[PDB]
Amino acid sequence: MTPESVMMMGTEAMKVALALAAPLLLVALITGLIISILQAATQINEMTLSFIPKIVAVFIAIIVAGPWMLNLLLDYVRTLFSNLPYIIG
Amino acid sequence: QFAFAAVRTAGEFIGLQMGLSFATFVDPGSHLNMPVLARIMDMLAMLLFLTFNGHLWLISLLVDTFHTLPIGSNPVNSNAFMALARAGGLIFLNGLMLALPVITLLLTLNLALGLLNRMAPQLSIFVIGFPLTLTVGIMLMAALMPLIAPFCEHLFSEIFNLLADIVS
Amino acid sequence: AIQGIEGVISQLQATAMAAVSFAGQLHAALDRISDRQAAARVQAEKFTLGEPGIALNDVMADMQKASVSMQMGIQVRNKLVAAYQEVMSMQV
Amino acid sequence: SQFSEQVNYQRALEGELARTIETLGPVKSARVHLAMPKPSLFVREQKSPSASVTVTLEPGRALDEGQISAVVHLVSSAVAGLPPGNVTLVDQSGHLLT
Amino acid sequence: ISQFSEQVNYQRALEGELARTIETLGPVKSARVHLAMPKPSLFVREQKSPSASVTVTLEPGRALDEGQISAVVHLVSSAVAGLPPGNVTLVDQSGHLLT
Amino acid sequence: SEQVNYQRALEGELARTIETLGPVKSARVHLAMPKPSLFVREQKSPSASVTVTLEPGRALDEGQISAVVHLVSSAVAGLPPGNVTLVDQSGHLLT
Amino acid sequence: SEQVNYQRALEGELARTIETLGPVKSARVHLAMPKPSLFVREQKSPSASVTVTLEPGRALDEGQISAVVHLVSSAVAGLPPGNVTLVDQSGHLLT
Amino acid sequence: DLNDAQLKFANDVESRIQRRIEAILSPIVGNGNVHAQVTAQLDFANKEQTEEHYSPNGDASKATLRSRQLNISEQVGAGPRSTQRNETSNYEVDRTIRHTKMNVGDIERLSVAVVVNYKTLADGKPLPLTADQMKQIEDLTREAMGFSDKRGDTLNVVNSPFSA
Amino acid sequence: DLNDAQLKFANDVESRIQRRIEAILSPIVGNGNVHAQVTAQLDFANKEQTEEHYSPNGDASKATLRSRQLNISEQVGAGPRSTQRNETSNYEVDRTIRHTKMNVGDIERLSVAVVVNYKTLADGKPLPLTADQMKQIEDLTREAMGFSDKRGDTLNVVNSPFSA
Amino acid sequence: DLNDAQLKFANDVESRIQRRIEAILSPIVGNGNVHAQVTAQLDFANKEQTEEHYSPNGDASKATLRSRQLNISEQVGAGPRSTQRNETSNYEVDRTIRHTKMNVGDIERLSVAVVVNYKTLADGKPLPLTADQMKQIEDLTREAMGFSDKRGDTLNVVNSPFSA
Amino acid sequence: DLNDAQLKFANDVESRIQRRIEAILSPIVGNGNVHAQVTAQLDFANKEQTEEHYSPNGDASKATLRSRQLNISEQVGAGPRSTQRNETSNYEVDRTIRHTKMNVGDIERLSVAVVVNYKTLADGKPLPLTADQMKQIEDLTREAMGFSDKRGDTLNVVNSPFSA
Amino acid sequence: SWSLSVQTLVFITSLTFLPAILLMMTSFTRIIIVFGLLRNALGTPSAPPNQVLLGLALFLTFFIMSPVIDKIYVDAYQPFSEQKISMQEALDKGAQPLRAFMLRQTREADLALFARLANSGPLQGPEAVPMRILLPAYVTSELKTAFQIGFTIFIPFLIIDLVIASVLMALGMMMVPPATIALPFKLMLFVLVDGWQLLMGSLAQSFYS
């Protein structure tokens, strides 16, 4: 009820969002950086060949860590809906 | 409503510096825009307004404006209307500050990306800048969330005493 | 209640320091109409009983007046309900 | 911030007023404190602003009744809607001159 | 600088200047002013009047005149929007209430 | 946090001025600033506890007790003097 | 976390001042602050437990017990004195 | 708490009455040749009172009127006389509302005990005072104490030699 | 808790009454030649009272009126006389509301025990006091204790030689 | 828990009454030549009472009125007389509401046992006291204990030589 | 659990009554020449009571009225007399509500057994006590125990030589 | 008591205000506001059709107000139907349990505000509050509680859209709408975590707590 509880609500929610999005974004960033440094080493420059492995890497990311995200988000939503009638004002 | 407008402005600008909706820079108003951060902070501001019992105050002030301005037809003033219209500045002015606590660092990040592009040409930006800046904006303003509440009370106080001063 | 009497003395102190409504009016009108109807009915039953002094003229006239008062109350209720329905139909 | 701007304006006015008050012959140094009224989140009400003026006089340089008057006028005029009667003038010994 | 911070800083600055002028007063060697500015709430009618506490240290034997106490009262009351004099307390270095 | 910090800073300054009183060697001020309740019959109000350490034998005058009360009450928005407790280093209630 | 930290800081400072009191060698304060409610009925009063260790033979006077009570009660928003328990190093309730 | 403040208030009032008595009793009887002590029954009960008074208007000379209807009929046929008088009068009356909040700490009943010494001449014989001097002391003490009969004040002044 | 505060309040009141008695009893009887102890029955019960009083208006001279209808009919034909008087009167009455909150800690009944010593002359014989001196002591103690009959105060002063 | 606090409250009250008795009984009987013990029946029952009182208005002289309708008819034809009086009166009455919360811990009944010693002269013979001295001790103890008959207080003072 | 607390409460009350009896019985009978034991029947039943009392108003002198309608008719033609009196009266009555919560742990019935020793003179013969001394012991024990007849208290004091 | 014609007239007239009782004195407002907000959250403004949600809200209100209705029936309707309590007293007797139910769920701040706006005297206990103060205080408290519940409901459905947009933006697909991708995932979430049982139980507890 108190504004401290509200702002905590937003923080924990958006940290959950950060945890959900961090693996995919970080995998894409690492793949892009690796392809870019390889291009710099080989002196190859086409703006389209960096887009190819990124999709494959990010799609594999759901294969490997997808169940973890799905279990984390469901637990968050379940706990939020269960604690809903105790943060009422 | 001006205070929630200001909060929405600050949120939309943080989100646009996230690169969340890049299609507006190329197609302004092209039916493709999602200010999701603006909505997040708008509903957070509504929750805070509910917590601080602003609506009760609104009802009380609606009652109180009678003593100041009775039902009976009374003469009226002018620049007073400007004041409400001039309150349109606040939406921008306060919005800049909320952002400031994050956009500036994001700016530095973009500056950092520029330093990377001053190296071997191409092979940067649109491939490495976007995910990094998205994650950095996310964690930055996630840490910045505790900051809005004092600014929320500041905004509500500004609107309320401006109303009290100008309605009379 | 003991606390209720405490509250009464508190309101008396409030009056000391300091030194009807539409629903009330409707309740008063309903009570008046019902009292008139009950008076007419009681006089009619007394006449039917055979008790002396009650004239058929007065019985019939009082029944007439009670019927008119009932019809007035019915019309007031009808309008009042119509006005309430009109107000509740306003779009905000 | 606007509030910061308002505080700065209040301070500057105080400074200039003290300045002119000192420039006056009998006055060696002046100190002006302004209380501008405030807004409320509810209820109408003006609070005619108020001023407190402390003067230090030159050895034995007592201020004339006319002088108190002129100090009063200047301070009152310099503050939008300052009712003279809300200006207090005091000496270095704590005597109320107004 | 937060909106709250901005206010607290304003309060501190006012306290400082008031103490300053009080000290400049001949008999006063040092002054200390504490302001309590109150809070508006949606559960009350007349907001509580602000209050002030003033502690003065006098020069050896420099007792303050009744008028000296009065003038201090006036200055402190005026410097605080809506400060009712009767809510200004003046105390010496020995703990004697002068007001 | 901003509020709690305000509380700590105020407590500190009040203790400071109290020590700056001839007979007082050190002061400790505790403030209880809470939220009130309307129409709860007898609610309550903000409260203060002041502990003073005196200089060897420097007993505080009744006036001294009164001036401490006034200062602490004024420094706290809506502090009713009667809710200020003053105690010495031996545990004697001075108020 | 912010609240729990505030509670442990208040406990610390209170123990600190209590130890300051001459006869007291060390103090330990435990606060139980309950859940607040903004409805029109739900309300509960907080409680405190104070353990003091005295200097060899330094028995606390009645007035002393009274002053400890006052200080602890004031430092906790809406703490009814009667909910402050004071105990010595031997387990005697000074309350 | 509040009881101690009330008790100190009573003590200060009693001490000041004692000092006022001593001040006038000193010049004539002498320093130390007079001792007085005062006890005060005080009023610490908060009372609030509202009083309403209406001026009587039963006499037609002081009666103020707003509207008056006087229907008079006399059908003389005492014989078959028929008198009928229907009188309706609406009055306006004087009204006085007084709201009083009694002060807390007023004095209800004051009783004062005063003792005087004897008179030791140059020889040293403790000669007692006279009736006229005793009456003068009683009057002075009554004046100093604010003696009143509505309150129920009692005063006792006796003459006796002081002990060593 | 609160009971101890009430008891300390009673002890302070009793001690101050004792000291006031001793103060006047000292100069004439002598230091140590008088001992007194006071017990006080106090009032720690919170009472709240609201009083309403109406001034009587049964006499037409003090009756205040707002509206009065007086229909009078006399059909003289005692014979076939027919008198009819229909009188309706609306009055306004004086009203006094008093709200009283009695103080907590007032004295209900005070009883005081005082003992005096004998008189040892230069020889050393413990000569008892006289009736007049005893009456003077009784009056002084009554004055000091605030003796009243409504409260139900009792006072006992006896004369006896003190032990070694 | 609370019972122990009540018991300690009773013990303190009894001890203070004992000390007050001993204080006055010491100077005349002597240190150690008097022993007293007090037991107190206390009141730990929370009682709340609201009292309403109406002043009687059956007498027309003290009756306060707001409205009065008096229809009087006399059709004289005792003969065929016909008297008819229809009287309607609305009154306003005095009202007094008293709300009382009795204090917890009051004394209900106090009984006190006092024993005194004999008198050993210079020879050493334990001479018993006299009737007058016993009556004086009884009166002093009654004063100290706050003896009252409404409470139902009992006092017993006996004289007997103390054991070694 | 709670039963043990109640039992300890009873034990403390009994021990304190025993000590109070012993305290007064010691100086005259002697240390060890008196033994007493107390048993207490206590009240651990929570009772709550609300009492309502109405003052009778059957007498017209103490009856308080708000409205009164008195229709009187007398048609004299005893002959063809016709009397008719229709009286309607609305009263306001005094009202007293008392709410009482009895204390838990009060004493219902106290019975005390006291035994005293014989008197061994310098020779050593155990001389029994006298009737007057036994009556004095009984009175002192009654005072110490708070003897009352409403409770139903019983006391028994017997004299017998103590065993070695 | 009133004549039978007057009683019938009053009964028929009072039968009109049933929607007003349901909306302003009953648990209906919070449930309907929460349902509307949730429908706004999932991105399907016409999904459970208004009639389906209205029927579910009516059944929920009937299940929630059961003890209040039972108390009214046992205390007011039963004595009135057995000719023991007059028609003008059954209403007063039955308005008390509803008043108590409205009070418990209301808030001090609203009560204080509406006690001040009426210029009424001090209300030392809740037993001195009339219906003219409790009605709008209860309404405002219910509105605020419903909006709080809905606004904490809204957060996960916006979190999903945020992460969807960020993931789409990592790969450079800046011209893909995020709402169209997020809607199936929001439906999947609301299916997985017992979307309705948890919400139903949370609302019911929110009343009985």
PDB file of N, CA and C in Angstrom, chain D residues 28-90:
ATOM      1  N   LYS D  28      25.330  51.909   9.013  1.00  0.00           N
ATOM      2  CA  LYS D  28      26.633  51.287   8.750  1.00  0.00           C
ATOM      3  C   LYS D  28      26.525  49.948   8.026  1.00  0.00           C
ATOM      4  N   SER D  29      25.518  49.153   8.374  1.00  0.00           N
ATOM      5  CA  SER D  29      25.196  47.893   7.698  1.00  0.00           C
ATOM      6  C   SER D  29      23.727  47.562   7.898  1.00  0.00           C
ATOM      7  N   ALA D  30      23.100  46.930   6.916  1.00  0.00           N
ATOM      8  CA  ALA D  30      21.709  46.505   6.986  1.00  0.00           C
ATOM      9  C   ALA D  30      21.576  45.021   6.651  1.00  0.00           C
ATOM     10  N   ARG D  31      20.524  44.420   7.225  1.00  0.00           N
ATOM     11  CA  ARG D  31      20.201  42.997   6.955  1.00  0.00           C
ATOM     12  C   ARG D  31      18.683  42.909   6.752  1.00  0.00           C
ATOM     13  N   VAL D  32      18.223  42.432   5.599  1.00  0.00           N
ATOM     14  CA  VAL D  32      16.810  42.327   5.247  1.00  0.00           C
ATOM     15  C   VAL D  32      16.467  40.856   5.095  1.00  0.00           C
ATOM     16  N   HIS D  33      15.394  40.434   5.753  1.00  0.00           N
ATOM     17  CA  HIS D  33      14.803  39.114   5.607  1.00  0.00           C
ATOM     18  C   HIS D  33      13.384  39.262   5.093  1.00  0.00           C
ATOM     19  N   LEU D  34      13.083  38.602   3.976  1.00  0.00           N
ATOM     20  CA  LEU D  34      11.766  38.600   3.371  1.00  0.00           C
ATOM     21  C   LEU D  34      11.093  37.247   3.600  1.00  0.00           C
ATOM     22  N   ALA D  35       9.813  37.271   3.948  1.00  0.00           N
ATOM     23  CA  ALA D  35       8.972  36.086   3.983  1.00  0.00           C
ATOM     24  C   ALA D  35       7.877  36.243   2.928  1.00  0.00           C
ATOM     25  N   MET D  36       8.114  35.697   1.732  1.00  0.00           N
ATOM     26  CA  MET D  36       7.040  35.714   0.704  1.00  0.00           C
ATOM     27  C   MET D  36       5.995  34.670   1.110  1.00  0.00           C
ATOM     28  N   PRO D  37       4.673  34.914   0.942  1.00  0.00           N
ATOM     29  CA  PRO D  37       3.645  33.943   1.327  1.00  0.00           C
ATOM     30  C   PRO D  37       3.779  32.636   0.530  1.00  0.00           C
ATOM     31  N   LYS D  38       2.885  31.669   0.761  1.00  0.00           N
ATOM     32  CA  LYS D  38       3.043  30.337   0.113  1.00  0.00           C
ATOM     33  C   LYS D  38       1.730  29.877  -0.520  1.00  0.00           C
ATOM     34  N   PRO D  39       1.737  28.875  -1.427  1.00  0.00           N
ATOM     35  CA  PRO D  39       0.498  28.332  -1.983  1.00  0.00           C
ATOM     36  C   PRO D  39       0.028  27.091  -1.203  1.00  0.00           C
ATOM     37  N   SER D  40      -1.265  26.761  -1.289  1.00  0.00           N
ATOM     38  CA  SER D  40      -1.778  25.546  -0.604  1.00  0.00           C
ATOM     39  C   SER D  40      -2.423  24.595  -1.615  1.00  0.00           C
ATOM     40  N   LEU D  41      -2.390  23.295  -1.326  1.00  0.00           N
ATOM     41  CA  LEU D  41      -3.006  22.279  -2.218  1.00  0.00           C
ATOM     42  C   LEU D  41      -4.525  22.341  -2.056  1.00  0.00           C
ATOM     43  N   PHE D  42      -5.014  23.200  -1.154  1.00  0.00           N
ATOM     44  CA  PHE D  42      -6.479  23.376  -0.965  1.00  0.00           C
ATOM     45  C   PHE D  42      -6.754  24.680  -0.215  1.00  0.00           C
ATOM     46  N   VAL D  43      -7.920  25.307  -0.426  1.00  0.00           N
ATOM     47  CA  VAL D  43      -8.346  26.506   0.366  1.00  0.00           C
ATOM     48  C   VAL D  43      -7.713  27.801  -0.157  1.00  0.00           C
ATOM     49  N   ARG D  44      -8.542  28.825  -0.399  1.00  0.00           N
ATOM     50  CA  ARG D  44      -8.047  30.154  -0.838  1.00  0.00           C
ATOM     51  C   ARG D  44      -7.635  30.967   0.381  1.00  0.00           C
ATOM     52  N   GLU D  45      -6.545  31.728   0.268  1.00  0.00           N
ATOM     53  CA  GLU D  45      -6.113  32.614   1.385  1.00  0.00           C
ATOM     54  C   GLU D  45      -4.825  33.355   1.019  1.00  0.00           C
ATOM     55  N   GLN D  46      -4.841  34.688   1.023  1.00  0.00           N
ATOM     56  CA  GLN D  46      -3.599  35.490   0.850  1.00  0.00           C
ATOM     57  C   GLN D  46      -2.909  35.644   2.210  1.00  0.00           C
ATOM     58  N   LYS D  47      -1.577  35.743   2.208  1.00  0.00           N
ATOM     59  CA  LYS D  47      -0.817  35.939   3.472  1.00  0.00           C
ATOM     60  C   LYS D  47       0.117  37.133   3.276  1.00  0.00           C
ATOM     61  N   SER D  48      -0.438  38.348   3.195  1.00  0.00           N
ATOM     62  CA  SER D  48       0.378  39.560   2.923  1.00  0.00           C
ATOM     63  C   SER D  48       1.824  39.325   3.358  1.00  0.00           C
ATOM     64  N   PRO D  49       2.802  39.341   2.427  1.00  0.00           N
ATOM     65  CA  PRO D  49       4.200  39.052   2.758  1.00  0.00           C
ATOM     66  C   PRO D  49       4.694  39.875   3.954  1.00  0.00           C
ATOM     67  N   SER D  50       5.814  39.459   4.548  1.00  0.00           N
ATOM     68  CA  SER D  50       6.360  40.208   5.694  1.00  0.00           C
ATOM     69  C   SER D  50       7.863  40.409   5.538  1.00  0.00           C
ATOM     70  N   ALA D  51       8.390  41.450   6.179  1.00  0.00           N
ATOM     71  CA  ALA D  51       9.811  41.775   6.144  1.00  0.00           C
ATOM     72  C   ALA D  51      10.342  42.102   7.545  1.00  0.00           C
ATOM     73  N   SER D  52      11.576  41.679   7.811  1.00  0.00           N
ATOM     74  CA  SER D  52      12.331  42.074   8.996  1.00  0.00           C
ATOM     75  C   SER D  52      13.639  42.713   8.566  1.00  0.00           C
ATOM     76  N   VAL D  53      13.873  43.925   9.049  1.00  0.00           N
ATOM     77  CA  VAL D  53      15.023  44.749   8.711  1.00  0.00           C
ATOM     78  C   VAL D  53      15.790  45.005   9.999  1.00  0.00           C
ATOM     79  N   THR D  54      17.052  44.597  10.031  1.00  0.00           N
ATOM     80  CA  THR D  54      17.973  44.932  11.116  1.00  0.00           C
ATOM     81  C   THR D  54      18.997  45.920  10.592  1.00  0.00           C
ATOM     82  N   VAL D  55      19.143  47.053  11.264  1.00  0.00           N
ATOM     83  CA  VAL D  55      20.136  48.074  10.928  1.00  0.00           C
ATOM     84  C   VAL D  55      21.175  48.176  12.029  1.00  0.00           C
ATOM     85  N   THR D  56      22.425  48.355  11.629  1.00  0.00           N
ATOM     86  CA  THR D  56      23.506  48.771  12.521  1.00  0.00           C
ATOM     87  C   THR D  56      23.810  50.220  12.223  1.00  0.00           C
ATOM     88  N   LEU D  57      23.709  51.077  13.231  1.00  0.00           N
ATOM     89  CA  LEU D  57      23.934  52.511  13.085  1.00  0.00           C
ATOM     90  C   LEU D  57      25.396  52.882  13.347  1.00  0.00           C
ATOM     91  N   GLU D  58      25.835  53.993  12.762  1.00  0.00           N
ATOM     92  CA  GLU D  58      27.122  54.598  13.096  1.00  0.00           C
ATOM     93  C   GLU D  58      27.150  55.063  14.570  1.00  0.00           C
ATOM     94  N   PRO D  59      28.300  55.020  15.285  1.00  0.00           N
ATOM     95  CA  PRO D  59      28.326  55.389  16.703  1.00  0.00           C
ATOM     96  C   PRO D  59      27.425  56.576  17.069  1.00  0.00           C
ATOM     97  N   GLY D  60      26.242  56.314  17.634  1.00  0.00           N
ATOM     98  CA  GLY D  60      25.368  57.405  18.113  1.00  0.00           C
ATOM     99  C   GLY D  60      24.457  57.976  17.042  1.00  0.00           C
ATOM    100  N   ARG D  61      24.477  57.409  15.836  1.00  0.00           N
ATOM    101  CA  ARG D  61      23.666  57.966  14.723  1.00  0.00           C
ATOM    102  C   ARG D  61      22.224  57.456  14.829  1.00  0.00           C
ATOM    103  N   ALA D  62      21.428  58.020  15.745  1.00  0.00           N
ATOM    104  CA  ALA D  62      20.021  57.580  15.931  1.00  0.00           C
ATOM    105  C   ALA D  62      19.199  57.902  14.679  1.00  0.00           C
ATOM    106  N   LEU D  63      18.286  57.007  14.286  1.00  0.00           N
ATOM    107  CA  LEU D  63      17.490  57.215  13.043  1.00  0.00           C
ATOM    108  C   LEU D  63      16.314  58.144  13.342  1.00  0.00           C
ATOM    109  N   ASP D  64      15.995  59.072  12.437  1.00  0.00           N
ATOM    110  CA  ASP D  64      14.867  60.024  12.637  1.00  0.00           C
ATOM    111  C   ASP D  64      13.522  59.306  12.496  1.00  0.00           C
ATOM    112  N   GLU D  65      12.436  59.858  13.057  1.00  0.00           N
ATOM    113  CA  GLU D  65      11.109  59.246  12.792  1.00  0.00           C
ATOM    114  C   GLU D  65      10.886  59.208  11.282  1.00  0.00           C
ATOM    115  N   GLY D  66      11.207  60.310  10.604  1.00  0.00           N
ATOM    116  CA  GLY D  66      11.092  60.330   9.136  1.00  0.00           C
ATOM    117  C   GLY D  66      11.915  59.204   8.544  1.00  0.00           C
ATOM    118  N   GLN D  67      13.073  58.909   9.142  1.00  0.00           N
ATOM    119  CA  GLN D  67      13.965  57.866   8.574  1.00  0.00           C
ATOM    120  C   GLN D  67      13.265  56.510   8.669  1.00  0.00           C
ATOM    121  N   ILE D  68      12.757  56.172   9.855  1.00  0.00           N
ATOM    122  CA  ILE D  68      11.994  54.903   9.998  1.00  0.00           C
ATOM    123  C   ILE D  68      10.962  54.890   8.872  1.00  0.00           C
ATOM    124  N   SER D  69      10.198  55.977   8.744  1.00  0.00           N
ATOM    125  CA  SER D  69       9.144  56.051   7.702  1.00  0.00           C
ATOM    126  C   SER D  69       9.735  55.694   6.338  1.00  0.00           C
ATOM    127  N   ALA D  70      10.805  56.385   5.930  1.00  0.00           N
ATOM    128  CA  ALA D  70      11.359  56.164   4.573  1.00  0.00           C
ATOM    129  C   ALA D  70      11.843  54.720   4.423  1.00  0.00           C
ATOM    130  N   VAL D  71      12.532  54.181   5.433  1.00  0.00           N
ATOM    131  CA  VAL D  71      12.939  52.749   5.356  1.00  0.00           C
ATOM    132  C   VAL D  71      11.676  51.920   5.114  1.00  0.00           C
ATOM    133  N   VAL D  72      10.653  52.152   5.936  1.00  0.00           N
ATOM    134  CA  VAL D  72       9.384  51.384   5.788  1.00  0.00           C
ATOM    135  C   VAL D  72       8.941  51.481   4.329  1.00  0.00           C
ATOM    136  N   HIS D  73       8.767  52.702   3.823  1.00  0.00           N
ATOM    137  CA  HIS D  73       8.244  52.870   2.441  1.00  0.00           C
ATOM    138  C   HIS D  73       9.090  52.046   1.471  1.00  0.00           C
ATOM    139  N   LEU D  74      10.407  52.239   1.470  1.00  0.00           N
ATOM    140  CA  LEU D  74      11.269  51.536   0.487  1.00  0.00           C
ATOM    141  C   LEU D  74      11.025  50.027   0.574  1.00  0.00           C
ATOM    142  N   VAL D  75      11.163  49.455   1.771  1.00  0.00           N
ATOM    143  CA  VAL D  75      11.044  47.969   1.871  1.00  0.00           C
ATOM    144  C   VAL D  75       9.664  47.539   1.363  1.00  0.00           C
ATOM    145  N   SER D  76       8.604  48.229   1.791  1.00  0.00           N
ATOM    146  CA  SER D  76       7.228  47.833   1.395  1.00  0.00           C
ATOM    147  C   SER D  76       7.104  47.853  -0.130  1.00  0.00           C
ATOM    148  N   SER D  77       7.540  48.940  -0.765  1.00  0.00           N
ATOM    149  CA  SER D  77       7.420  49.062  -2.239  1.00  0.00           C
ATOM    150  C   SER D  77       8.200  47.941  -2.928  1.00  0.00           C
ATOM    151  N   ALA D  78       9.395  47.610  -2.435  1.00  0.00           N
ATOM    152  CA  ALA D  78      10.229  46.616  -3.163  1.00  0.00           C
ATOM    153  C   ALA D  78       9.620  45.204  -3.184  1.00  0.00           C
ATOM    154  N   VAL D  79       8.563  44.977  -2.409  1.00  0.00           N
ATOM    155  CA  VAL D  79       7.978  43.610  -2.323  1.00  0.00           C
ATOM    156  C   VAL D  79       6.534  43.680  -2.817  1.00  0.00           C
ATOM    157  N   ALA D  80       6.234  42.967  -3.901  1.00  0.00           N
ATOM    158  CA  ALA D  80       4.875  43.033  -4.474  1.00  0.00           C
ATOM    159  C   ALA D  80       3.857  42.811  -3.354  1.00  0.00           C
ATOM    160  N   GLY D  81       2.941  43.761  -3.168  1.00  0.00           N
ATOM    161  CA  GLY D  81       1.883  43.612  -2.151  1.00  0.00           C
ATOM    162  C   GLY D  81       2.438  43.462  -0.749  1.00  0.00           C
ATOM    163  N   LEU D  82       3.422  44.282  -0.373  1.00  0.00           N
ATOM    164  CA  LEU D  82       3.903  44.238   1.034  1.00  0.00           C
ATOM    165  C   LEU D  82       3.216  45.359   1.811  1.00  0.00           C
ATOM    166  N   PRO D  83       2.295  45.039   2.738  1.00  0.00           N
ATOM    167  CA  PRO D  83       1.643  46.062   3.554  1.00  0.00           C
ATOM    168  C   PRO D  83       2.631  46.637   4.578  1.00  0.00           C
ATOM    169  N   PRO D  84       2.982  47.938   4.499  1.00  0.00           N
ATOM    170  CA  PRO D  84       3.967  48.525   5.403  1.00  0.00           C
ATOM    171  C   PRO D  84       3.872  47.917   6.806  1.00  0.00           C
ATOM    172  N   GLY D  85       2.670  47.923   7.379  1.00  0.00           N
ATOM    173  CA  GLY D  85       2.486  47.398   8.742  1.00  0.00           C
ATOM    174  C   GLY D  85       3.128  46.027   9.003  1.00  0.00           C
ATOM    175  N   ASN D  86       3.527  45.286   7.958  1.00  0.00           N
ATOM    176  CA  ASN D  86       4.228  44.001   8.075  1.00  0.00           C
ATOM    177  C   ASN D  86       5.754  44.137   7.927  1.00  0.00           C
ATOM    178  N   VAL D  87       6.284  45.363   7.963  1.00  0.00           N
ATOM    179  CA  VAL D  87       7.723  45.634   7.966  1.00  0.00           C
ATOM    180  C   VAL D  87       8.148  45.962   9.391  1.00  0.00           C
ATOM    181  N   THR D  88       9.061  45.163   9.932  1.00  0.00           N
ATOM    182  CA  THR D  88       9.660  45.405  11.249  1.00  0.00           C
ATOM    183  C   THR D  88      11.072  45.937  11.072  1.00  0.00           C
ATOM    184  N   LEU D  89      11.392  47.064  11.705  1.00  0.00           N
ATOM    185  CA  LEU D  89      12.730  47.661  11.696  1.00  0.00           C
ATOM    186  C   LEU D  89      13.310  47.621  13.108  1.00  0.00           C
ATOM    187  N   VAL D  90      14.499  47.049  13.264  1.00  0.00           N
ATOM    188  CA  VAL D  90      15.173  46.850  14.555  1.00  0.00           C
ATOM    189  C   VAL D  90      16.616  47.351  14.468  1.00  0.00           C
TER     190      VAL D  90
END
